[PDB]
Design a protein around this nucleic acid. Structure first.
Ligand code: FES
Ligand SMILES: [Mg+2]
Ligand SMILES: [Mg+2]
Ligand SMILES: [Zn+2]
Lengths: 278, 38, 157, 37, 177, 50, 65
RNA sequence: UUACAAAUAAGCGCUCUCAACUUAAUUUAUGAAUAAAAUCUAAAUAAAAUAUAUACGUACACCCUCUAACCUAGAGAAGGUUA
């Protein structure tokens, strides 16, 4: 019932929809990493692509420019509804006021005042379109406490010829005269489980029915790990948001009925004739 | 005149100073003459 | 003052020039500065004195025309540079050739500047207390100026 | 722009300049005579 | 004085707010004045153990001036604590990036090198320009004379004052000027 | 030993305390410390720094 | 200046400055930081001390007037 | 591809990698001192021109229910999940 109540953003006192101008930055989605699968282009090359599913992605809170402490405003975008029985009372109270089921993860997106979206607005995979380069960031797989060789790729010491109890150990820590170890030295420690970002990942296809985006290459995190998809910040992709929906796509608006699967021009769709390199 | 942490305390204390004045209990009063032989 | 008016016919016309104040305090002063008993009593901040020797765009006038003795032709020239760098002559800015705008960077307030800001390198190794390197303040040419302090002015800070 | 302890004019056309805190002799006729301190 | 003991103790050791204007003022002279008030050296009841410092508010820190070529010759150094983390930045660059740092550093340098310096530094309030918050304005109790007399610009001088200064020399009528 | 070497250091610090407070006191009225002390003596009035 | 009557004990002023709005009693790190702002001091001043230093303190220090 | 002749972990497999407010050797332009048909200027001024770096932008931001059990989280503790 709560999810259905918010199914119609545009018919629920939406905020003004200002037009796009140069320098605008949109909001981004939080998706679940289903896995990977192969993909082919009309040139015949195979591109490894990963599947990201948007699940109950609803904007939660809207801070203003000044209070946010940044130049830009900031929106919070939660996803992946979870149970209510094992959450602190404070979190449940905040979600009850918002009128939405609790979400697994919160993240902050820097959004210009023109592109602001009212809190509680549902977000879908139609926010993106094939072609747009996108950036994904998530916690890396945690590998636990590891040695200096595996963590930083230290060469190590030979196994034979007399090396006695020294095979994977670090070498000389630092210089002798300084009588100390420089801060930040590479030493054995826990690896992984650190927030990292991948930049310039093209969007190959968008599945509207299941809200699945096909993102080129590898994305950080384990399978079923939540990520933070966002419009790419690289200089070449500075003004790729103009063509796409400026605030977002509202299916409830029903401006246009999109197909289930959206492809890029180079992508070779299945069921097409076999590729011939004429 | 009176000093205070707040205006009300300063106002209340300022009254204390005046009452001494009228009664001449200002600390700078002529010291009691304990040394009179008589 | 002879100035050229263009019309092509261009004509230079002599116009009346302001006359110098008569009765200098010191009669027969060989150099104009000494005539007025200002030999060793002027500094960079004396805009009124310095302005009397400067071209409309901030350039120095020739010694001959000004009449100052070389000793006071260099000191006056040195003080003028300090005044310009300190923004004490806002109405004598350089002539912009083709309406070019200023650099638009904010101007750092400076005074008693011996050298051009562009030509001074930073002192990365300050030096220790005994060997400490000094930063120039003022100019040596003003050594003889009257001092109203207990001890001589410290040129190097 | 050879950096030398002493700057000496190599031709009559040579002239002296004080650029960016150092002394320069630049010769219009011959760029070879250009020097720095 | 005939004041009660507790009000008398409160009055004597109360703390004051002083406003200093840094326009065309060298930071050092500001530092000399500011540091003295912060420690409480201006009070005849000053004691190193009494914590009698007072608040000082300095404005227009962006408009400070330096003698000579100190803008391009004075260098501030910092180390991040990692190899290659040594940065030497000239005063002009630091002032451009952070207008308030240069004034803050001078006061920090002059203050005594002990734990109380950090407590004193809290009392210092620096604003890049004349803008002040509402609460601070109410707090202010007095202002202090600027240490350096600001020389007047030629445009500032009145026409009559220009006349008062005698004309040292007059160019001949046959001069382009 | 420190107690013995500090009996002749409270007589020099307590004086430096006085000079700090006299310098503060005169400055309120516009006089530097050297001017205040020297002139008072030159008037033949002898008052110590305590 | 005329006394402004329209708006008071110092205890009330402290409560207004140290308003408890979030989390009821704040944790020491947050609470001490809030106190440090009000009095323009550092956090280190407000942190406690152990039982060695506490017992060194005099019970009845001398009083002069 | 090689193992565990376990659902995993590796590389020999695969994908992604970016901006410069502030410069130096140097080069221009206007222009006086220096009576020019001069002069890049430790004269007043306008620009261009290495490496650096942090003006700028990413990342984090959420404040605590935890008998318990599970976990791509983990030495312990912490952390995540529980219609
Ligand atoms: S000022 Fe008298 S000789 Fe020049
Ligand atoms: Mg090996
Ligand atoms: Mg072995
Ligand atoms: Zn030559």
């Amino acid at each position: 019932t709560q999810l259905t109540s918010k199914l119609n953003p545009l018919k629920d006192e939406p905020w003004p929809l200002h037009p796009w101008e140069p320098g605008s930055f949109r909001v981004g989605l939080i998706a679940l990493k289903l896995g990977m699968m192969p993909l082919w282009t009309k040139d015949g090359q195979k591109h490894a692509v990963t599947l990201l599913q948007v699940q109950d992605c609803h904007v939660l809170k809207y801070t203003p420019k000044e209070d946010h402490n940044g130049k830009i405003a900031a929106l919070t975008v939660g996803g992946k509804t979870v149970s209510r029985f094992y959450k602190p009372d404070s979190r449940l109270e905040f979600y009850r006021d918002l009128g939405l089921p609790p979400k697994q993860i919160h993240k902050i997106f820097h959004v210009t005042d023109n592109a602001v979206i009212k809190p509680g607005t549902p977000l879908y995979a139609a926010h993106f379109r094939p072609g747009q380069y996108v950036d994904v960031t998530a916690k890396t797989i945690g590998k636990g406490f590891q040695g200096v060789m595996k963590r930083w790729g230290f060469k190590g010491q030979p196994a034979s010829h007399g090396q006695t109890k020294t095979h994977r150990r670090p070498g000389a820590i630092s210089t002798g005269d300084i009588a100390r170890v420089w801060p930040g030295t590479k030493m054995p420690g826990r690896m992984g489980n650190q927030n990292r970002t991948v930049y310039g990942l093209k969007v190959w296809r968008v599945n509207t029915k299941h809200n699945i985006i096909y993102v080129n290459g590898s994305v950080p995190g384990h399978k079923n790990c939540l990520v933070k998809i966002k419009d790419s910040t690289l200089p070449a992709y500075k003004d790729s948001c103009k063509n796409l929906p400026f605030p977002t796509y509202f299916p409830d608006g029903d401006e246009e009925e999109l197909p289930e699967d959206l492809f890029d021009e180079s992508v070779w769709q299945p069921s097409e004739p076999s590729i011939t390199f004429a | 005149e009176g000093p205070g942490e707040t205006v009300l305390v300063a106002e209340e204390e300022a009254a204390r100073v005046a009452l001494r004045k009228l009664y001449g209990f200002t600390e700078n009063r002529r010291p009691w003459d304990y040394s009179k032989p008589k | 003052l002879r100035e050229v008016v263009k019309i092509t016919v261009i004509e230079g016309r002599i116009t009346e020039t302001p006359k110098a104040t008569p009765d200098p305090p010191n009669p027969s002063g060989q150099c104009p500065i000494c005539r007025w008993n200002l030999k060793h009593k002027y500094t960079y901040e004396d805009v009124l004195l310095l302005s009397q020797f400067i071209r409309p765009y901030g350039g120095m006038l020739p010694r001959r025309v000004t009449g100052l003795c070389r000793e006071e032709h260099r000191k006056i020239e040195e003080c003028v540079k300090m005044a310009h760098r300190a923004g004490l002559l806002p109405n004598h800015r350089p002539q912009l050739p083709e309406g070019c705008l200023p650099k638009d960077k904010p101007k750092l307030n400076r005074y008693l500047t011996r050298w051009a800001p562009k030509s001074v390198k930073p002192i990365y190794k300050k030096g220790h207390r005994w060997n400490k390197v000094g930063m120039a303040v003022g100019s040596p040419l003003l050594k003889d100026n009257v001092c109203y302090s207990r001890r001589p002015l410290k040129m190097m800070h | 722009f050879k950096t030398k302890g002493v700057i000496k004019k190599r031709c009559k056309d040579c002239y002296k300049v004080k650029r960016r805190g150092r002394w320069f002799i630049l010769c219009k006729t011959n760029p070879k005579h250009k020097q720095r301190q | 004085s005939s004041f009660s003991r507790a009000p008398q103790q409160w009055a004597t050791f109360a703390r004051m707010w002083y406003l200093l204007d840094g326009k065309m003022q060298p930071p050092g002279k500001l530092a000399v004045i500011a540091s003295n008030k912060l420690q409480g050296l201006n009070k005849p009841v000053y004691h190193q153990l009494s914590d009698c410092g007072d608040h000082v508010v300095i404005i227009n820190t962006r408009h400070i001036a330096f003698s000579g070529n100190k803008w391009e010759q004075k260098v501030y150094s910092s180390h991040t604590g990692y190899p290659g983390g040594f940065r030497q930045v000239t005063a002009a660059q630091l002032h451009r990036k952070d207008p308030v740092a240069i004034v803050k550093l001078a006061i920090y340098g002059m203050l005594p090198k002990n734990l109380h310096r950090r407590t004193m530094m809290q009392r210092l309030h620096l604003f890049p320009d004349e803008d002040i918050p509402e609460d601070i304005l109410k707090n202010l109790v007095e202002e202090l004379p600027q240490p350096r007399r600001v020389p007047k610009r030629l445009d500032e001088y009145t026409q009559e004052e220009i006349e008062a200064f005698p004309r040292v020399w007059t160019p001949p009528d046959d001069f382009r000027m | 030993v420190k107690c013995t070497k500090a009996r002749r250091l409270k007589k020099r610090n307590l004086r430096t305390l006085w000079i700090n407070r006299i310098t503060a006191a005169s400055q309120e009225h516009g006089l530097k410390y050297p001017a205040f002390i020297v002139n008072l003596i030159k008037c033949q009035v002898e008052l110590n720094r305590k | 200046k005329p006394i402004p009557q329209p708006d008071e004990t110092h205890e009330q002023i402290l409560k207004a400055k140290l308003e408890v709005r979030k989390s009821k009693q704040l944790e020491q790190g947050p609470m001490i930081e809030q106190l440090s702002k009000v009095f323009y001091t550092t956090k280190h001043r407000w942190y406690p001390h152990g039982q060695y230093h506490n017992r060194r303190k005099k019970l009845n220090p001398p009083r002069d007037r």
